[PDB]
Amino acid sequence: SNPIRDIQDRLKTAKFDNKDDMMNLASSLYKYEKQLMDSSEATLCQQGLSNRPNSFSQLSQFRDSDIQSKAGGQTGKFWQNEYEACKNFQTHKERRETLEQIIRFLQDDLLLKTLARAYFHRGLLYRPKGFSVPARKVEAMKKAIAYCEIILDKNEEESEALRIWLYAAMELRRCGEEYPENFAEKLFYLANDGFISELYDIRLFLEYTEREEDNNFLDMILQENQDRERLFELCLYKARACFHLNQLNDVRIYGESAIDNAPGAFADPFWDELVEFIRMLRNKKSELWKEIAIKAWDKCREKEMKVGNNIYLSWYWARQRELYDLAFMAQDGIEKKTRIADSLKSRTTLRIQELNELRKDAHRKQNRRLEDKLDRIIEQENEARDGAYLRRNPPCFTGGKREEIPFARLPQNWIAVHFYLNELESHEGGKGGHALIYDPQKAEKDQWQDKSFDYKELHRKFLEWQENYILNEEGSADFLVTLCREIEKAMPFLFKSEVIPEDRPVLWIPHGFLHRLPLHAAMKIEIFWERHASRYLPAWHLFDPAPYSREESSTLLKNFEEYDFQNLENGEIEVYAPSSPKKVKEAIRENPAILLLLCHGEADMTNPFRSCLKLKNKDMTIFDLLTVEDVRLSGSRILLGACESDMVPPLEFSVDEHLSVSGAFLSHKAGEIVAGLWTVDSEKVDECYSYLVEEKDFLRNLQEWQMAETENFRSENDSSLFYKIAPFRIIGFPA
RNA sequence: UUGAUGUCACGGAACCUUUGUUGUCUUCGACAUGGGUA
RNA sequence: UACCCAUGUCGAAGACAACAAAGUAUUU
């Protein structure tokens, strides 16, 4: 760079009456000091300035207090202008460096106004991730307000300071803070000014419109120029303005235009404003709200498809859940309600499944560098669930052939129950819980029912059982019985034949914490499994019946030396013990007909990827399973004898997901998995899985086993015995 | 100087990064002071 | 507003110049 030479050139030209000369001189001297403070390579310059008496006189004149302090504000304003010009050509890092340079340089009303605007723009860079806002965003907006109030304490008519103050106050509200005090009075001054300086002002005059109920300024908005980059956002403001003028057809037109041009990135503020607009329409009870909500859902669903990995998916798309709640309430058709519900489920597991598919093709083609990319994405996802900072942008992957599965592809003798837990409806005091039930044998106009229930008390009793389980654990059996009776209290329709016809099998597609429950064990005494056999899927778009594996080979791997599994160890399947993770990795690439694993297991309390199987000399985690190079399990049947092999951490993740060990095996396209929702007894495991292996029809045989044990439950209604029958469930839907 | 049928704050390491360092022969010769006489 | 010299004595430097706190990613 050679900044010393730049100081020479400026000192040749400069005269002290001229703004540009002093602006340039101040800039050059500041850059010199900056390079010294950075210990830059420019510090190797040992040269000095020539014409020493002249240079001394000119520097001594510049460093007059008024001259340099005058030049400071002008340099700051010039940099602030050039930033706001090139802002959308810069990357984030260099936008940040520009703004922080301005702030450090400026740390007179011109200076204070420039510094307030710089802090306002520095805050705008921070974006919420998940349901959390960065603290520094709030900090920046509060500092902008603090600087603004020095000017406004002595000149309340100053338009720029007032506007910056109002912008920062609106951002505080957006972050979930309250408005600062005397917001109303200052917002009334702004309307006494009555002119749009910048795009943000349109949002202020609408706030004024909604507060003073005054329509004068709406014609300014409707006449605003269309030659803008963020056209979708301007059109959304047009729609609001038309609504206050009751120009409802133009509201429809502008709203449709805004949604049709929505941006791809869910980090964009457009997506917040759209949901606020729909909530405004709904709260004013306008009939337009149902049209706009369904189009907004369709656009959001279209663009979720283009999100590149689970990290961005968890950060930014997860915040759009309320839009699906609103669209679910707008939509009256039950099948279309079910489509809206299903589009929210297991969006991360879908991408893990696609990565597992990609790894197959890389291995068979020996594309090593692609395997490293596939490993990096899983590693970074594991980091993100620990909340760690990511140094590198995670890579993006295009999706698989995501066809929309027709509901007609369910076989004719089944019943399907689709759950949805609408938080917005629940929080407003409605039922909020929905069960959408499909009977494919009826005429098409009668094939769907929609049953609704209140899930607050069921969720409380779930949390209560969960905590008692973590602390006791088997002393929690009474709380399990309480929860299972609460299932029937909440969903009394489960035991009515006009809802679920006689003795047909049921497929469950849960949502939220309902993935955690033993719905097959709902207790009227009569248990649900006495009426129907049950099967589970995480989501309907994962429905994919494939044939069972053809291989004439099966394996039992055991690392469990406290106990003798007399029934399993005298079957026709050969047993290898004590099994290490290497043996599991070997069996997993032979595509066995039946694979049994008998070992201890443990679900993690914080991060799903750390849930593990306790094998001989080393634990095998979900992270290990999802990074095994060569895996061949298409159509295999898997029986997990491990405790908590279908459990997940006692937390609510930002997106709907059930990443248990069983879920990990399903993401490798296993045919069906049997696993435990909590701790499992070794004798019950032995006697259940021996019968399943002998009679190779898991759906009927698990029901027969459950019924045959229930007759010993009835003689005394012992909670401890029910605690031992209930945990087993089947996941997956083979051909 | 509380308000009451509901407080995990013993629910949170002032933590993290930084070389008292860079340059210098224990050497060596002409200099002080202000008048005096016509 | 000209001219002329006269006397022989004696240690010096003892730290100086620079820096005097500065930084501390939240994301296509």
Handedness of CA A494, A499, A504, A505 (dihedral sign): negative
Q: In which element (H, E) is residue A619 found?
A: strand A619-621
Nucleotide nearest to A37 (CA to C1'): C22
Angle at the Cα of A100 from the Cα atoms of A99 and A103, rounded to 5 degrees: 90
| Residue A604 to residue A590: CA distance in whole angstroms | 29
In sequence order, the β-bridge partners of residue A596 are A556, A639
Asked whether the beta carbons of A593 and A573 are under 8 A apart, the reply is no
Instruction: Judge residue A372's burial from the number of C-beta atoms within 10 Å of its C-beta, 0-12 exposed, 13-18 middle, 19 or more buried.
Output: exposed
- Gap from A133 CA to B14 C1', Å: 24
Residue A711 DSSP SS3:
helix
- Of the candidates A641, A672, A474, A675, the one whose C-alpha atom is nearest the C-alpha of residue A567 is A641
CB-based contacts of A328-337 (< 8 A; 24+ apart in sequence): A328/A420, A328/A422, A329/A293, A329/A422, A329/A424, A329/A425, A330/A289, A330/A290, A330/A291, A330/A293, A330/A294, A331/A290, A331/A294, A334/A436, A334/A448, A334/A449, A334/A450, A335/A407, A335/A448, A337/A420, A337/A434, A337/A436, A337/A450
Asked whether the beta carbons of A594 and A554 are under 8 A apart, the reply is yes
Asked whether the beta carbons of A718 and A708 are under 8 A apart, the reply is no
CA A49 centroid distance within chain: 58
Residue A125 DSSP SS3:
coil
For residue A209, the tally of other CB atoms under 10 A from its CB is: 20
- Of the candidates A593, A558, A560, A588, the one whose C-alpha atom is nearest the C-alpha of residue A575 is A558
* Strands A612-614 and A555-559, sheet pairing: unpaired
Residue A45 DSSP SS3:
coil
Nucleotide nearest to A128 (CA to C1'): C26
Extract the runs of DSSP E, i.e. beta strands, from A443-498. 448-454
What is the residue whose two structure tokens read 């009679």? Answer: A695
Extract the runs of DSSP E, i.e. beta strands, from A289-444. 415-421, 432-438
Nucleotide nearest to A307 (CA to C1'): C28
User: Tell me, what amino acid is at A564?
Assistant: D
- Gap from A215 CA to C14 C1', Å: 86
In sequence order, the β-bridge partners of residue A557 are A576, A597
- Residue A310: CB partners within 8 Å, gap ≥ 6? A348, A351, A352, A381, A384
Asked whether the beta carbons of A486 and A458 are under 8 A apart, the reply is yes
Nucleotide nearest to A264 (CA to C1'): C28
- Residue A55: CB partners within 8 Å, gap ≥ 6? A8, A11, A49
Nucleotide nearest to A104 (CA to C1'): C23
- Gap from A605 CA to C1 C1', Å: 115
Residues in chain A: 735
Handedness of CA A55, A57, A58, A60 (dihedral sign): positive
Resolution (A): 2.5
| Residue A160 to residue A151: CA distance in whole angstroms | 10
- Of the candidates A78, A157, A69, A83, the one whose C-alpha atom is nearest the C-alpha of residue A120 is A83
Angle at the Cα of A15 from the Cα atoms of A10 and A17, rounded to 5 degrees: 135
Q: Which technique was used to obtain these atomic coordinates?
A: cryo-EM
DSSP state of A527: B
| Residue A591 to residue A364: CA distance in whole angstroms | 16
Residues with CB under 7 A from strand C: A 37, 91-92, 96, 100, 104, 125-127, 129, 134, 136, 265-267, 307-308, 312, 315-316, 389-391, 393, 396
Q: Could you give the count of Cα atoms lying within 13 Å of A474 in the half-sphere of its Cβ?
A: 10
- Of the candidates A282, A281, A263, A377, the one whose C-alpha atom is nearest the C-alpha of residue A320 is A263
Q: Please provide the distance, in angstroms rounded to a whole number, between the alpha carbons at the two ends of chain A.
A: 70
Burial A422-431 (b: 16+ CB within 10 A, else e): bebbbeeeee
Q: In which element (H, E) is residue A506 found?
A: strand A506-509
User: Tell me, what amino acid is at A44?
Assistant: L
User: Tell me, what amino acid is at A471?
Assistant: L
What is the residue whose two structure tokens read 């709030």? Answer: A138
In sequence order, the β-bridge partners of residue A594 are A637
Q: In which element (H, E) is residue A508 found?
A: strand A506-509
In sequence order, the β-bridge partners of residue A209 are none
| Residue A127 to residue A351: CA distance in whole angstroms | 24
DSSP state of A528: G
For residue A732, the tally of other CB atoms under 10 A from its CB is: 25
- Gap from A44 CA to B24 C1', Å: 22
Instruction: List chain C nucleotides near protein: any atom < 7 Å from a Cβ.
Output: 22-28
